[PDB]
Coordinates of C-alpha atoms and ligand atoms in Angstrom, one line a residue:
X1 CA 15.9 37.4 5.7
X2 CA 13.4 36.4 2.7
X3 CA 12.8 32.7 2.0
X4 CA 12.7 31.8 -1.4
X5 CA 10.2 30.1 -3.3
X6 CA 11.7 26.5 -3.2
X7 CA 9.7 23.8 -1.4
X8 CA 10.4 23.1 2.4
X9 CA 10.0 19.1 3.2
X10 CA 9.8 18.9 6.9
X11 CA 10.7 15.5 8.7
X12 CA 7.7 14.5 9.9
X13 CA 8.1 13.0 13.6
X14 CA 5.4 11.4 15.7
X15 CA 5.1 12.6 19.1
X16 CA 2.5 11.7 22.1
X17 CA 0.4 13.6 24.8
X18 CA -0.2 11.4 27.7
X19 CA -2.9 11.0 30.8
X20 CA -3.4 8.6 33.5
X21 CA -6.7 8.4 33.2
X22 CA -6.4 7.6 29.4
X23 CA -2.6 6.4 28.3
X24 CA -0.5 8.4 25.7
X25 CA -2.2 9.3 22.0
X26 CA -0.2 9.4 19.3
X27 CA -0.3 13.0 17.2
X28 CA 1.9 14.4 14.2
X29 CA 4.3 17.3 14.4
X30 CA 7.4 18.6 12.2
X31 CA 10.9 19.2 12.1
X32 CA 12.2 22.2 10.9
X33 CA 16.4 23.2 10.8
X34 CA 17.4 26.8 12.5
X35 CA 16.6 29.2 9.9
X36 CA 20.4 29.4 9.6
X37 CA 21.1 25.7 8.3
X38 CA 18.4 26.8 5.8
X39 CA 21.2 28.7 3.9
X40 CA 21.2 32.8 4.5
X41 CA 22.5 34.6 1.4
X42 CA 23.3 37.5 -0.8
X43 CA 22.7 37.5 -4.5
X44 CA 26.7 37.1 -5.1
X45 CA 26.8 34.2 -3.2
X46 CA 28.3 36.1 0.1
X47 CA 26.7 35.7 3.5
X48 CA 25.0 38.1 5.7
X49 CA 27.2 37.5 8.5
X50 CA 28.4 35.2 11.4
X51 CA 28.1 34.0 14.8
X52 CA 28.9 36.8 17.0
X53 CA 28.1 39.9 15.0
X54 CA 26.2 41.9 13.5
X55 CA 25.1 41.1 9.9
X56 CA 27.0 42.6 6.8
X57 CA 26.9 46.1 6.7
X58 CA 26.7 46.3 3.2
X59 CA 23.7 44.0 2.6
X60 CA 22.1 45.1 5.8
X61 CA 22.6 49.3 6.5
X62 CA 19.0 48.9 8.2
X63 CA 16.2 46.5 8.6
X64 CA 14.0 46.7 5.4
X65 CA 17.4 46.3 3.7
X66 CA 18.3 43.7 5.3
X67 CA 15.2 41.6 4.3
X68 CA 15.4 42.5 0.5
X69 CA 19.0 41.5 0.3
X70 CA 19.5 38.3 2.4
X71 CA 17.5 35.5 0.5
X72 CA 17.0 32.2 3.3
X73 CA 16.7 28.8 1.0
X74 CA 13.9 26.3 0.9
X75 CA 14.8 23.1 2.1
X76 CA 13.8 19.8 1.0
X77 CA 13.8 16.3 2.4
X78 CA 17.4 16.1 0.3
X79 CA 18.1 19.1 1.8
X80 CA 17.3 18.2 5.5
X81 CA 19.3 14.7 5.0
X82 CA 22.5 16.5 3.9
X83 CA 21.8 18.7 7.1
X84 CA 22.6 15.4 8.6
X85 CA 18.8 15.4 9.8
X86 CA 16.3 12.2 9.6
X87 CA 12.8 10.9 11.2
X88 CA 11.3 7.6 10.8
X89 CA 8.1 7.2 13.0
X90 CA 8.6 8.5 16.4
X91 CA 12.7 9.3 16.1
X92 CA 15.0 11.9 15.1
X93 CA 18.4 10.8 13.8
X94 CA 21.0 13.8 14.2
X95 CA 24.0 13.2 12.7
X96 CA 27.7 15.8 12.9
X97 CA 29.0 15.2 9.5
X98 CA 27.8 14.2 6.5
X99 CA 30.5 13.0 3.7
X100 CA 33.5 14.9 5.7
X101 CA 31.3 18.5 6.2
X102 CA 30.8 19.6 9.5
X103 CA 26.8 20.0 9.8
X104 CA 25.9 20.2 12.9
X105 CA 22.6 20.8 13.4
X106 CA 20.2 22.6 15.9
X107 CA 16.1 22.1 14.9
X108 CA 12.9 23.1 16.6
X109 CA 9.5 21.0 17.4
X110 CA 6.3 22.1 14.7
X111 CA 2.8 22.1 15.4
X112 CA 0.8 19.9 12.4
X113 CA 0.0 23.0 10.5
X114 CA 3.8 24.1 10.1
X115 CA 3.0 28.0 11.2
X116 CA 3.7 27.8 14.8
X117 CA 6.1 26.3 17.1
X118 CA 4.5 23.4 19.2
X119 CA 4.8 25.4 22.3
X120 CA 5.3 23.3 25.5
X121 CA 4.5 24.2 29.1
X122 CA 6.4 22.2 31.6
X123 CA 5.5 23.3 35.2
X124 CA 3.4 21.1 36.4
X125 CA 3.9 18.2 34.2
X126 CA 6.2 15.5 32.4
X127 CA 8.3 15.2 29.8
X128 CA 9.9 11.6 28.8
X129 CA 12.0 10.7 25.8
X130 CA 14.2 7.5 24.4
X131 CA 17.7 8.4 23.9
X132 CA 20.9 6.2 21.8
X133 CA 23.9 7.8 23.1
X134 CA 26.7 5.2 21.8
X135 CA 27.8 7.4 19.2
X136 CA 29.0 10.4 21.3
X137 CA 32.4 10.5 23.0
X138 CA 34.3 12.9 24.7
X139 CA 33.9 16.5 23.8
X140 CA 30.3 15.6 22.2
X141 CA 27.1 17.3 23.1
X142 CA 24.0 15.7 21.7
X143 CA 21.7 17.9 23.5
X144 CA 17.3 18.4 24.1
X145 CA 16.7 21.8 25.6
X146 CA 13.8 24.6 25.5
X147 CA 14.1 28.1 25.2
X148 CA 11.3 30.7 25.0
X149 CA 11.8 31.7 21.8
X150 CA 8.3 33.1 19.8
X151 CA 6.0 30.5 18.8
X152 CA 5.5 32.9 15.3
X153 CA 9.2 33.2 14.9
X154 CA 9.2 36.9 15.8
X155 CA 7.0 37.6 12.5
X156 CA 4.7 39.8 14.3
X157 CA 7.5 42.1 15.8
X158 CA 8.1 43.4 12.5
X159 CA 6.7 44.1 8.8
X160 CA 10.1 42.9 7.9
X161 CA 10.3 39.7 9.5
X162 CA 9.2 36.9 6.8
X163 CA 10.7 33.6 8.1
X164 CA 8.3 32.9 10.9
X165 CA 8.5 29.5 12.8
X166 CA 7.9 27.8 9.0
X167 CA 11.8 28.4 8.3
X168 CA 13.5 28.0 11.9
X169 CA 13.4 31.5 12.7
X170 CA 14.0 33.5 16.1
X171 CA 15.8 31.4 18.4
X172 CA 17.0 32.4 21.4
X173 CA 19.0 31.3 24.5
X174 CA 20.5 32.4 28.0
X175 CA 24.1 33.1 26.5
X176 CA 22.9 35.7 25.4
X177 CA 25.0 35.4 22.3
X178 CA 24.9 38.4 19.3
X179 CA 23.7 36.7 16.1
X180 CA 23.3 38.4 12.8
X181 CA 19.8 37.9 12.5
X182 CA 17.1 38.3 15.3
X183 CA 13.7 37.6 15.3
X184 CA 13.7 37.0 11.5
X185 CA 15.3 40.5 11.0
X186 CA 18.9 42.2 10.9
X187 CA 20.4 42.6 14.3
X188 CA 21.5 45.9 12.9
X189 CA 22.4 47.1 17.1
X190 CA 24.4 44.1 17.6
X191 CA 22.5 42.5 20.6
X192 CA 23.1 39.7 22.8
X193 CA 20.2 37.8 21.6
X194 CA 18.4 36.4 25.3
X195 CA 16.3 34.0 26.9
X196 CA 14.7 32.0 29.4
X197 CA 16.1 28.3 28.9
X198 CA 15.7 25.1 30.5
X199 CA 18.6 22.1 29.6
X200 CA 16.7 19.1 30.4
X201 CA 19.3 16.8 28.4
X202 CA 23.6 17.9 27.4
X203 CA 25.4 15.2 27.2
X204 CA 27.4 12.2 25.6
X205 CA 28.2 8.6 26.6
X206 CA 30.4 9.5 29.2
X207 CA 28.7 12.3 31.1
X208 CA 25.1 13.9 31.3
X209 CA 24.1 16.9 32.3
X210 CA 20.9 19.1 33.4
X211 CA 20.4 22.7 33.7
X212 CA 17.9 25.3 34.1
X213 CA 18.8 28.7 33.1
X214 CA 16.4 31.7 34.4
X215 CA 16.2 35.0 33.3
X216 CA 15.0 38.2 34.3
X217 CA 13.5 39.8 30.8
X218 CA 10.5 37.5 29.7
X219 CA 10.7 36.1 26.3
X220 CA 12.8 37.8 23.8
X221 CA 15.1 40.4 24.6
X222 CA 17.9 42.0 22.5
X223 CA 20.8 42.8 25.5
X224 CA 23.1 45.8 25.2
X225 CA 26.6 46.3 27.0
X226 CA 26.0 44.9 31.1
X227 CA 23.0 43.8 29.9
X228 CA 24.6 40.5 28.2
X229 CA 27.2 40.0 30.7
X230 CA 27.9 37.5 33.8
X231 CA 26.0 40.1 36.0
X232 CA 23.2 40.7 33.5
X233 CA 19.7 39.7 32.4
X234 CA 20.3 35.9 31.9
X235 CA 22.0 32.9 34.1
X236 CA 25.1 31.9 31.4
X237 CA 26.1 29.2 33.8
X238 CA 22.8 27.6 35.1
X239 CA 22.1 25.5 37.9
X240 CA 23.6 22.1 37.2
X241 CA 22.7 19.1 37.9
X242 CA 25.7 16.1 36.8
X243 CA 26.5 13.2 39.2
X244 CA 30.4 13.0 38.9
X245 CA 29.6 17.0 40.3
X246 CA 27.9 15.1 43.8
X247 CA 30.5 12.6 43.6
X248 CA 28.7 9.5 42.2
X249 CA 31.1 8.6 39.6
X250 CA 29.6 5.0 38.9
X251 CA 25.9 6.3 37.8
X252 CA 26.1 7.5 34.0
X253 CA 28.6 5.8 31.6
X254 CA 29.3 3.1 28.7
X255 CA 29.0 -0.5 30.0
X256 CA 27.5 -2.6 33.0
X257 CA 29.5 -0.7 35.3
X258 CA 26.9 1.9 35.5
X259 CA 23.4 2.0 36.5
X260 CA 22.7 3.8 33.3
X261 CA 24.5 2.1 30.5
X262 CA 25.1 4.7 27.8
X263 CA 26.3 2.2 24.9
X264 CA 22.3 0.8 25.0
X265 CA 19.1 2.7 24.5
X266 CA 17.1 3.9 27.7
X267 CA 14.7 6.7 28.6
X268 CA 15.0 9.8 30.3
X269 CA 11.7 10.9 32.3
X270 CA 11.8 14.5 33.8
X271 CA 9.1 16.1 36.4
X272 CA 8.6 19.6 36.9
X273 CA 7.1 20.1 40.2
X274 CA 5.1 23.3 41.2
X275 CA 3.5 24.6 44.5
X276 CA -0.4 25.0 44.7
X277 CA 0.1 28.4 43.5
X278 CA 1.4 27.1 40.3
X279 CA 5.1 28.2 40.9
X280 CA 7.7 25.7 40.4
X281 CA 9.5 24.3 43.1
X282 CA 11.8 21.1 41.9
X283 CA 12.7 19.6 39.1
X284 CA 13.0 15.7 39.0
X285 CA 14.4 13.3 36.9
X286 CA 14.7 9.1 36.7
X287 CA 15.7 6.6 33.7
X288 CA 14.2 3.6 33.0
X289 CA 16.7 0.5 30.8
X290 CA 15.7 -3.0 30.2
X291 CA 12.4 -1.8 31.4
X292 CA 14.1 -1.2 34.8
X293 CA 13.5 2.1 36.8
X294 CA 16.5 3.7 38.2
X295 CA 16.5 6.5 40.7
X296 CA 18.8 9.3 40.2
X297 CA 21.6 9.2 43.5
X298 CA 21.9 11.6 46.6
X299 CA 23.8 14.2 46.5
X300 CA 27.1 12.3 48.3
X301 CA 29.2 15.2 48.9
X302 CA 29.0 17.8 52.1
X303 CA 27.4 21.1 51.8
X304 CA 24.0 20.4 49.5
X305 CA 20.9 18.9 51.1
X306 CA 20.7 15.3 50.8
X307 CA 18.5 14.8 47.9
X308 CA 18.7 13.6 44.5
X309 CA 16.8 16.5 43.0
X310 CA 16.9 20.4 41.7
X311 CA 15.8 22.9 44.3
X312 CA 16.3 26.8 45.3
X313 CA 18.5 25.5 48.4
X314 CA 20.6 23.0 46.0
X315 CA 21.4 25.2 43.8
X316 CA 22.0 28.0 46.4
X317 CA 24.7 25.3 48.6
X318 CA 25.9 24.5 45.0
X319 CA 27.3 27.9 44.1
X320 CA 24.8 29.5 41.7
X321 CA 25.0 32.8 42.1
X322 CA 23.1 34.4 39.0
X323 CA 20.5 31.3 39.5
X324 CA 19.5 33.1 43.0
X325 CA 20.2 36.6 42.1
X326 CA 17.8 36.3 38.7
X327 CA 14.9 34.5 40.1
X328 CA 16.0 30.9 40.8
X329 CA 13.4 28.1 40.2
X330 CA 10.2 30.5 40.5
X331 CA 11.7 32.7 37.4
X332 CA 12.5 29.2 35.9
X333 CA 9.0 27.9 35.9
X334 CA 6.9 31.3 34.9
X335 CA 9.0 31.0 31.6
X336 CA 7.7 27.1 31.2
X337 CA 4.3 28.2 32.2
X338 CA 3.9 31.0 29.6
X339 CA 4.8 28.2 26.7
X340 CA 8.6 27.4 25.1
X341 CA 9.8 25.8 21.8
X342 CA 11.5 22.0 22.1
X343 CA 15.2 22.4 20.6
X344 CA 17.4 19.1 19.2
X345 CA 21.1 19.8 18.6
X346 CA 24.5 18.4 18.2
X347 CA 27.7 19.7 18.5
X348 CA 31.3 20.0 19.6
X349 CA 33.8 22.7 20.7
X350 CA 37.0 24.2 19.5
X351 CA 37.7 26.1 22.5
X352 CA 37.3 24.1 25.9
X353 CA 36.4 21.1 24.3
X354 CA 32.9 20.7 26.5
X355 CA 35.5 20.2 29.7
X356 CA 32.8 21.2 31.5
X357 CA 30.5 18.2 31.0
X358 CA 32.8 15.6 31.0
X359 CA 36.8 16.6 32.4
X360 CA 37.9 16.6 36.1
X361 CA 35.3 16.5 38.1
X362 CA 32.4 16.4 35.3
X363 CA 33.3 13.2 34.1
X364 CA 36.4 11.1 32.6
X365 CA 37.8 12.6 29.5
X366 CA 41.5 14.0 30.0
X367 CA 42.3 17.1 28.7
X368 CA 42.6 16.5 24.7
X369 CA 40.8 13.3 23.5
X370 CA 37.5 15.8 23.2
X371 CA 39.4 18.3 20.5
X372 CA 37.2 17.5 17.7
X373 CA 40.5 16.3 16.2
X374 CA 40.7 13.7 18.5
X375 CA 36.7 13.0 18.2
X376 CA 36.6 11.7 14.9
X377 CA 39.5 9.4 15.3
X378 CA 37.6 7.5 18.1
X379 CA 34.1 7.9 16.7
X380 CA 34.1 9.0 12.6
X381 CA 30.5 9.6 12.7
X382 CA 29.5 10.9 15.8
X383 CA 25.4 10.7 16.1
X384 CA 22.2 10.6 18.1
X385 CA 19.2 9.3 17.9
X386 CA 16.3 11.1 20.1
X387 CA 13.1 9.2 20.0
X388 CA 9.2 8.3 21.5
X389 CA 8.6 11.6 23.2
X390 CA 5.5 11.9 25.1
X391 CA 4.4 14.7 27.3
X392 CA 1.9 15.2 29.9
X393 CA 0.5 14.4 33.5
X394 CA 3.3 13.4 36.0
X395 CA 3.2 9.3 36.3
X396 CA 1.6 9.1 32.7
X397 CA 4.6 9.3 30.1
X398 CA 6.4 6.8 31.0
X399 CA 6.6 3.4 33.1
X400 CA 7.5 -0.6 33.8
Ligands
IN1_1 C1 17.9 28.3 28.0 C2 18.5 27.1 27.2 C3 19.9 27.3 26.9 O1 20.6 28.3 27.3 O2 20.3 26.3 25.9 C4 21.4 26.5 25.0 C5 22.5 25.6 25.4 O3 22.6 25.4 26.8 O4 22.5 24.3 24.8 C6 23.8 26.3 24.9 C7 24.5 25.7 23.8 O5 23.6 25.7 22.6 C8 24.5 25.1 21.6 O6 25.4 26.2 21.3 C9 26.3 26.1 20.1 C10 27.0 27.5 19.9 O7 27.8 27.6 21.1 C11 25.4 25.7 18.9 O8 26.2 25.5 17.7 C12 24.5 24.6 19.2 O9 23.6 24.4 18.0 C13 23.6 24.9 20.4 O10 22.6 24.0 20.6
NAG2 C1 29.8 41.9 3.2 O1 29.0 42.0 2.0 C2 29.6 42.7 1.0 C3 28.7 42.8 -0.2 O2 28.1 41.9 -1.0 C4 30.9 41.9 0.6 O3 31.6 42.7 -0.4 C5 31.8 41.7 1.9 O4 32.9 41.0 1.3 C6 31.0 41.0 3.0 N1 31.8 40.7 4.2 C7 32.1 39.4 4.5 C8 32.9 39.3 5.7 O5 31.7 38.5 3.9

């Protein structure tokens, strides 16, 4: 599409790059909504298509087209707090609704200068972040993921691509799912719209979850027929990582039954292990509350190794299939080392309900009480608040 000429008021959030030798040092970046949220339009006030297809056919016959007819709008700070997004310091307040309208929003991580997504490479280092999870109940997903979208929002793939990075363009993820717009231009073909994705954080107060997701096209790719399938380019199902999956039930949940009380504030620190040839080998992850370190559990079912982290053999004695088949953790890694935009969401579903991060044996919602029906009767405003994040040298980020 083609932005408009209104002004665009980023949130500005405060985020830190952290050493041993030296602490963590504060630094500005920006918030910026998916180019979507923005508002993508046609002169009569008609859309240029949903979520799962191509865009209009009328407004977009081919790509130059495309661009002149489907106008993206400026967003201000008004704009960006009826988008049920806000910052104050170092935190990010995502709320679902906003005066009864579903808003739902997904935003990206910006460099200072606004141009460029802050691009983040992971293998090898840290990440840590603060995290209020109260306000999500079953069925919720309040969710901190990368994906290796372009850091120019796919301007320089095309003459017609205008939104850039500056307006949330060109995301991307490993469901490969067809969206009307790709790369900041028409997806005139219809293409599954891949890649590369790591799920460092999916959850709400009753269940947590952690996924990689390798593929085997770097970057970008538009997918066509097999392509974007279960035996295609991209791992749809990831290798996951949930402790009611390895049977330790009493870990993650609201109250002092659990060794990570979700109704309180803690922080989530994740470590990206590589080999000396710079591949990664293991993901690891730990939680610190009432300035407490806890240690994420064993694996206490049969079958996995006995370990409390992700590796190729885990994942492998864990059934992931298309994890091993695409790559596994090496494939993982050589998309965190070539650089991938930070992604804050929340969300629901009307389909299964997100049964698979907290039903059975994910977790302790029954079958219904997640219908986002049922959500708002237990939690009217369901919201999270995603704060301090530092990144850098493994052991500097975070600590007692
Ligand atoms: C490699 C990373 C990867 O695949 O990450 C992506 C995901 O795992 O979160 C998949 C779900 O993403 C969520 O999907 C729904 C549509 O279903 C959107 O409305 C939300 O904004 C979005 O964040
Ligand atoms: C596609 O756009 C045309 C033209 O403006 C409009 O007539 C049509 O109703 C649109 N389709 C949808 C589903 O909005």
């Amino acid at each position: 599409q083609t932005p408009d000429k209104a002004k665009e008021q980023h949130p500005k959030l405060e985020t830190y790059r952290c050493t041993k030798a030296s602490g963590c040092k504060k630094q500005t970046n920006y918030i910026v909504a998916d180019a979507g949220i923005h508002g993508i339009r046609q002169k009569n006030g008609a859309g240029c298509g949903d979520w799962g297809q191509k865009p209009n056919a009328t407004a977009c016959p081919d790509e130059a087209s495309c661009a002149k007819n489907c106008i993206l709008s400026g967003m201000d700070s008004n704009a960006y707090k009826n988008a049920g997004i806000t910052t104050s310091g170092n935190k990010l307040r995502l709320q679902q609704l906003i005066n009864n309208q579903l808003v739902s929003p997904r935003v990206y991580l910006l460099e200072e200068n606004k141009k460029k997504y802050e691009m983040l490479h992971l293998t090898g280092t840290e990440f840590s972040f603060d995290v209020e999870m109260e306000k999500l109940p079953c069925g919720m997903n309040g969710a901190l993921y990368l994906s290796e979208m372009p850091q120019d929002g796919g301007k320089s793939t095309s003459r017609n691509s205008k939104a850039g990075a500056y307006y949330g363009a060109g995301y991307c993820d490993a469901q490969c799912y067809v969206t009307p717009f790709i790369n900041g231009v028409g997806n005139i073909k219809g293409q599954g719209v891949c890649c590369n994705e790591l799920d460092i954080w999916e959850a709400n107060s009753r269940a947590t979850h952690i996924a990689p997701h390798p593929c085997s096209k770097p970057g970008l790719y538009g997918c066509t027929g097999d392509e974007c399938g279960s035996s295609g380019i991209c791992d749809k199902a990831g290798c996951g990582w949930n402790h009611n999956r390895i049977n330790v039930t009493d870990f993650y949940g609201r109250g002092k039954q659990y060794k990570v009380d979700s109704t309180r504030k803690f922080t989530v620190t994740s470590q990206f292990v590589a080999n000396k040839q710079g591949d990664l080998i293991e993901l690891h992850r730990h939680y610190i509350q009432d300035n407490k370190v806890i240690e994420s559990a064993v694996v206490n079912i049969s079958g996995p190794p006995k370990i409390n982290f992700i590796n190729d053999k885990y994942c492998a004695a864990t059934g992931a299939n298309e994890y091993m088949r695409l790559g596994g953790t090496k494939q993982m890694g050589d998309a965190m080392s070539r650089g991938m935009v930070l992604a804050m969401s929340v969300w629901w579903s009307e389909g299964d309900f997100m049964a698979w991060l907290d039903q059975g044996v994910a977790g302790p919602c029954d079958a219904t009480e997640g219908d986002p029906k049922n959500i708002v009767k237990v939690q009217p405003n369901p919201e999270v608040t995603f704060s301090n994040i530092r990144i850098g040298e493994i052991g500097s980020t975070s600590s007692v």
